[PDB]
């Protein structure tokens, strides 16, 4: 069996079928566009912090720190892609390069462990809770977020070798995920009490963005197996789709999320 590409799904397909120049180039450009948008996000949150009352600026700060970590780690992920796979002129495809370092989703997973807590935390600086304690929500978010990403990371090891383990850890991870959604809805509901109808409208959009953007991750996790073990997506197409959904998700969950919280902060601040 394959000793080289046993690490993850990307390595496996790279070590066996290889990637068409279209698939490799597409994935390369989408990862580059990924970190490019984080760098543009970083400068947006820096330049706009003066547009919100001091009260809300901790949200804009956390957006900025998320953009820094995202840019740096997704830049690493992009380099990790182009370095891991070299062209073979004989076969006319890209294959896992033994002389390079093997492809590694650890860059993105580490980014998640850092950003998930900050992203969950930062809404508590724009909204006021009603009947819930700030510390309780914070602790619930931080714990469930860490556990979601840790169980998810553990599950990701058994992605190729043991699908039973892959899905069980994935389901454990999904349990913590559903708890986060449940608390976030509660937070957003309490957030709507006490604010103008304009601000309640933005919180509605934040909720839908949050719900969709965050649901793309377990989608991308499962992406290789959504058509079976011999399916359309058990190929370079599964790798394409996954890295594309991860990028869409990362841009929506971090950058768009942050822009809507800043907009919320602005309609709250200086608007009477
Ligand atoms: C800035 C990056 C963000 C918001 C990352 C979010 C990550 C998740 C919501 C991932 C959760 C997962 C599951 C629900 C099950 C499978 C494993 C994960 C980690 C992909
Ligand atoms: C009133 C709201 C204004 C929305 C502006 C959003 C700007 C966010 C910056 C990130 C997007 C730029 C993408 C560039 C890719 C390189
Ligand atoms: C009042 C200052 C507002 C300036 C915002 C300009 C947005 C810059 C986009 C960065 C990419
Ligand atoms: C729970 C998530 C923990 C992720 C740790 C993995 C760190 C990998 C760093 C980049 C890849 C190194 C090669
Ligand atoms: C009590 C219900 C609140 C949580 C809403 C969850 C929506 C579906 C999750 C999709 C995955
Ligand atoms: C119905 C109102 C739509 C605005 C909310 C945001 C749209 C969802 C974006 C999904 C993220 C990918
Ligand atoms: C006034 C409300 C506007 C909110 C929408 C802001 C969307 C910014 C998009 C940034 C990411 C674009 C990625 C390019 C592909
Ligand atoms: C690359 C784009 C940063 C503003
Ligand atoms: C890594 C710890 C797993 C806990 C499962 C509930
Ligand atoms: C991968 C680009 C993200 C598109 C913004 C909605
Ligand atoms: Kr900032
Ligand atoms: Kr940076
Ligand atoms: Kr950081
Ligand atoms: Kr860099
Ligand atoms: Kr899920
Ligand atoms: Kr939570
Ligand atoms: Kr809450
Ligand atoms: Kr690919
Ligand atoms: Kr997106
Ligand atoms: Na290469």
Author numbering: 2 to 273
Authors' own words:
High pressure atmospheres of argon and krypton were used to produce noble gas derivatives of crystals of three well studied MPs (two different proton pumps and a sodium light-driven ion pump). The structures obtained using X-ray crystallography showed that the vast majority of argon and krypton binding sites were located on the outer hydrophobic surface of the MPs – a surface usually accommodating hydrophobic chains of annular lipids (which are known structural and functional determinants for MPs). Taken together, the results obtained show that, in addition to binding in internal cavities within the MPs, noble gas atoms interact with MP hydrophobic surface at many sites and displace lipid molecules bound to their surfaces. In the experiments described here, we extend our knowledge as to how noble gas atoms bind to MP molecules, showing that they readily interact with the outer hydrophobic surface of MPs by non-specific binding at multiple sites and in particular compete with binding of lipids to the surfaces of the systems studied.
In total, 47, 35, 11 and 19 noble gas atoms were identified as partially occupying positions in the four crystal structures (tmBR-argon, tmBR-krypton, KR2-krypton, MAR-krypton, respectively). Moreover, at many positions (11, 13, 8 and 6, for tmBR-argon, tmBR-krypton, MAR-krypton and KR2-krypton, respectively), noble gas atoms replaced, at least partially, lipid atoms, with an altered conformation of lipid chains being sometimes clearly visible. However, in the particular case of KR2-krypton the backbone of helix E is displaced about 1 Å near the site of two krypton atoms bound in a pocket proximal to ß-ionone ring of the retinal molecule which maintains an unchanged conformation compared to the native crystal structure. In the case of KR2 described here, surface-bound noble gases occupy excavations between α-helices allowing them to closely approach, and perhaps modify, the chemistry of essential co-factors (retinal) by modifying their environment (substantial structural perturbation of the end of helix E). Taking into account the absence of noble gas atoms in central cavities of KR2 molecule, it may be of interest to investigate the functional outcome. Secondly, and most strikingly, all the crystallographically observed positions belonging to the 2nd group (“MP surface” positions) were entirely represented in the results of MD simulations except one krypton position hidden in an excavation, passage to which is blocked by histidine side chain in KR2 structure (in fact, this position is not accessible in the MD experiment as are the internal positions, binding to which requires more significant rearrangements in macromolecule structure).
